[PDB]
């Protein structure tokens, strides 16, 4: 039942106790400890400073605009062409290749995936994009 | 209550008997519980009559004339409870009119050392009940420590001043059967720092309730975590004070260091992030230059060069979303950043002026047990807590002489005889005394019994001002050296004209230095006249008694003037300055529980001493050597009511010795 | 003592 706002426990009382200038030797420790974060603080935040300065600018110089293409569901040679590549630079990544196709929803590439299968030889594109 | 309250007001439980009751009532108290409540009644009711009209003796007729049936049933079981009543002094003590005159036969001789209050006390008991009795008094007056300074209208207590509250107090009696004029002592006290400058109420506040979270904290340390023994050595409540203080210097620091700790691990997630989006900038921007080429390759082209046109714009659009979260994340962290640095934890536990505001609440505390802090025991030094008076604390604007000088009449003093040696044997005592003026003057006083009421301070005093013979015993000497006798001095300062608030009674003066916490730390106003009373407490008391009356109302001047102003200031008519350490006839101001003692010490002075047999072989004599003040009484130790209580309970142990119970 | 002290 100690008092509300003083901290007292067994072990901070013997560390206190146990010697003769424990007291004010406890309180360097900490003293310095402090000096030590303190110090911490303003290398990593003139760190922090100078990566801050290395953004200057975000990526609004690069930033391209949005294409609002239309999903269709009649697949066009260009279209088959582009997927066969997509599958070749990416893996099962269906997301990606509907990005590329810009007018193929994920569940078509799903679908695209095992209709031409035997005729695009999906199976050997997949064995080159695995081999890199 | 009427009947629970006089048991209140008696010091005793209304509804039970007490270890003193059951030892003079062993039939009653080991029998069945009705006749306890006979027993419990006829008690209360005596006492209820005794407090109703104290001006007067309550005989035992009295006492049974106005007893109702079934409690005036019993005549014998009344007579033994007014009787056991009126020797242990709980009715007829102090000054009270006689109804029958005491008879002119005497039976007895009692020798009491001091006519101080406990002295006083003991002295009028023993006569009551036939006794022959002579007090020696060293000094050319009674009261001892009830010391009243006197000059024209000027009034003004160097000794006790306070009565701590009427409830349960025996002074209250004593108030009726003599006129004192008590008035009530307003809590209001300001405190002014070295400058002048009244402590601000937020301040003044918040080291008060500190100062009392800290001494909380030291019984805590006591009870709770046993931390009552360092180095082979008793714990002081000033080494505790000390530790407390230094936990909650460590805490604010261990405080500080767990919120920057937490700082630089967030400057140090920030650091990973802003490393990531700089890398991820530079692969923006390497991928942007590619798809820029890729797309100025102008149609018509065959399809590879379409693809890849397509997926570096897919593949950009991807880095561009990561960046945009990145940043997003970047912007949570550096809010929670901004309120890191919004919320810091306390600078320090205690500034400068803090503690030395502190440090006026600690010489307050050594004013009261009248040390130093480090002198005190940490477990036992507030052992009498639990006896205290309820109400309002008083002061006698008559001067507290008129309570000693009043309980005096009638009784045979011999002033300026200073006892220097006490002889006592199987067959009585012999008391040797001298002449305070002439020291070649030599008194013989023989008598069967030897009431010492020496202040704590004269029966430390090394080489002995006072010769036993035989020697004290080792259990009595020992008590002795182990229980402390402070030390604390009043500045009287006479005016022509109230130049303070005239509705303050108090109002402190804190000091520059931990080591001056004490001097001249409080004033009192209490009187009709214009006089200004000032505190020497702690460590300053000893030091102070070494300087000249002049410079310490210099000091005193200059303090005054620092907050009421050069011009409001005059110099004073009358000064005098207690120096109590110094007195001869008390060797310092009251007992406290020293670091090494308890409460068990006070009983131990409290024992009567048994001498041996005068032939071998002879049976075992009475008790000759009784021992009554302030230091021989565990429950009201360092008081006026606890001198008095004392000579009554000695007066009470002689009576039933002498004259038989 | 305790008692005797002021402000209490
Ligand atoms: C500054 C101060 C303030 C106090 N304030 C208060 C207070 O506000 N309220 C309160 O209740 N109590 C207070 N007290 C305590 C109170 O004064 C005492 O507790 C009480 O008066 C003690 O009475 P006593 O009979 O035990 O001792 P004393 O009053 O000292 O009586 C002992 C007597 O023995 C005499 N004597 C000493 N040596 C010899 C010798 N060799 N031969 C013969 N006689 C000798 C002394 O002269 C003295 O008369 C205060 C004490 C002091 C010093």
């Known amino acids: 039942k100690p008092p509300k706002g003083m901290f007292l426990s067994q072990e901070d009382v013997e560390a206190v106790s146990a010697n003769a200038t424990a007291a004010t030797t406890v309180l360097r420790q900490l003293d310095m400890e402090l000096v030590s974060v303190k110090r911490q603080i303003q290398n990593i935040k003139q760190t922090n400073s100078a990566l801050k300065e290395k953004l200057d600018g975000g990526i609004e110089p690069y930033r391209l605009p949005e294409v609002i293409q239309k999903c269709n569901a009649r697949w066009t040679t260009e279209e088959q062409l582009l997927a066969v590549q997509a599958i070749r630079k990416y893996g099962r990544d269906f997301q990606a290749i509907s990005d590329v196709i810009g007018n193929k929803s994920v569940v078509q590439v799903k679908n695209f995936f095992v209709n031409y299968r035997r005729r695009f030889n999906i199976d050997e594109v997949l064995q080159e994009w695995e081999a890199e | 209550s009427g009947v629970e309250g006089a048991a209140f007001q008696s010091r005793l439980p209304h509804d039970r008997m007490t270890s003193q009751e059951a030892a003079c009532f062993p039939d009653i108290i080991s029998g069945p519980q009705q006749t306890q409540k006979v027993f419990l009644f006829i008690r209360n009711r005596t006492l209820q009559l005794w407090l109703d009209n104290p001006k007067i003796q309550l005989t035992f007729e009295a006492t049974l004339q106005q007893l109702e049936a079934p409690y005036n049933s019993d005549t014998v079981l009344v007579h033994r409870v007014h009787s056991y009543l009126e020797r242990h002094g709980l009715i007829n003590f102090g000054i009270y009119k006689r109804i029958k005159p005491l008879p002119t036969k005497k039976t007895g001789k009692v020798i009491i050392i001091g006519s101080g209050v406990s002295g006083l006390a003991a002295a009028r008991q023993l006569q009551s009940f036939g006794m022959d009795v002579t007090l020696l008094e060293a000094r050319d007056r009674v009261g001892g420590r009830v010391a009243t300074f006197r000059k024209g209208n000027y009034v003004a207590d160097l000794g006790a001043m306070v009565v701590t509250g009427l409830g349960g107090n025996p002074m209250a009696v004593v108030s009726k059967q003599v006129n004192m004029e008590l008035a009530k002592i307003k809590q209001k006290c300001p405190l002014y720092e070295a400058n002048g400058q009244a402590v601000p109420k937020e301040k003044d506040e918040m080291v008060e309730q500190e100062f009392n979270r800290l001494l909380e904290a030291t019984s805590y340390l006591s009870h709770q975590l046993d931390f009552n023994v360092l180095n082979n050595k008793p714990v002081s409540l000033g080494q505790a004070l000390e530790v407390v203080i230094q936990l909650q210097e460590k805490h604010v620091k261990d405080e500080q260091i767990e919120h920057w700790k937490k700082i630089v691990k967030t400057q140090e997630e920030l650091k990973e992030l802003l490393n990531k989006m700089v890398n991820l900038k530079e692969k923006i921007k390497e991928l942007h230059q590619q798809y820029k080429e890729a797309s100025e390759v102008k149609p018509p082209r065959d399809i590879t060069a379409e693809f890849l046109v397509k997926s570096k714009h897919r593949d950009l659009t991807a880095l561009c979303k990561e960046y945009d979260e990145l940043a997003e994340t970047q912007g949570k962290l550096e809010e929670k950043l901004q309120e890191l640095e919004a919320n810091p934890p306390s600078d320090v536990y205690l500034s400068s002026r803090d503690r030395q505001i502190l440090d006026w609440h600690f010489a307050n505390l050594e004013f009261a047990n009248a040390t130093p802090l480090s002198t005190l025991s940490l477990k036992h030094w507030d052992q009498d807590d639990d006896f205290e008076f309820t109400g309002s604390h008083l002061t006698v604007r008559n001067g507290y002489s008129c309570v000693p000088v009043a309980l005096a009449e009638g009784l045979d003093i011999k002033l300026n005889t200073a006892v220097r040696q006490v002889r006592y044997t199987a067959s009585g005592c012999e008391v040797i005394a001298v002449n305070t003026r002439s020291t070649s003057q030599t008194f013989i006083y023989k008598c069967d019994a030897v009431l010492c009421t020496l202040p704590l301070g004269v029966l430390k005093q090394q080489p002995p001002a006072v010769q036993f013979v035989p020697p004290l015993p080792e259990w009595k000497t020992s008590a002795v050296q182990r229980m402390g006798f402070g030390n604390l001095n009043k500045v009287v300062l006479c005016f022509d004209r109230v130049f303070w608030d005239p509705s303050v009674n108090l109002f402190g003066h804190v000091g520059s230095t931990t080591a001056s916490r004490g001097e001249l730390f409080l004033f009192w106003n209490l009187y009709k006249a214009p006089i200004l009373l000032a505190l020497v407490a702690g460590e300053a008391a000893g030091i102070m008694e070494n300087i000249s009356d002049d410079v310490i109302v210099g000091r005193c001047l200059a303090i005054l003037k620092g907050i009421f102003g050069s011009s409001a200031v005059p110099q004073p008519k009358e000064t005098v300055v207690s120096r109590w350490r110094a007195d001869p006839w008390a060797r310092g101001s009251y007992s406290y529980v020293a670091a090494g003692s308890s409460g068990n010490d006070y009983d131990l002075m409290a024992q009567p001493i048994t001498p041996g047999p005068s032939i071998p072989g002879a049976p075992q004599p009475i008790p000759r050597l009784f021992f009554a003040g302030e230091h021989t009484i565990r429950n009201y130790p360092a008081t006026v009511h606890g001198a008095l209580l004392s000579g009554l309970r000695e007066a009470g142990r002689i009576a039933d010795q002498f004259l038989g119970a | ?8």
């Not at chain 3, 003592?1 to 209490?8: G, I, K, N």
């Open chain 3, 1 to 8: 003592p305790r008692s005797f002290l002021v402000r209490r």
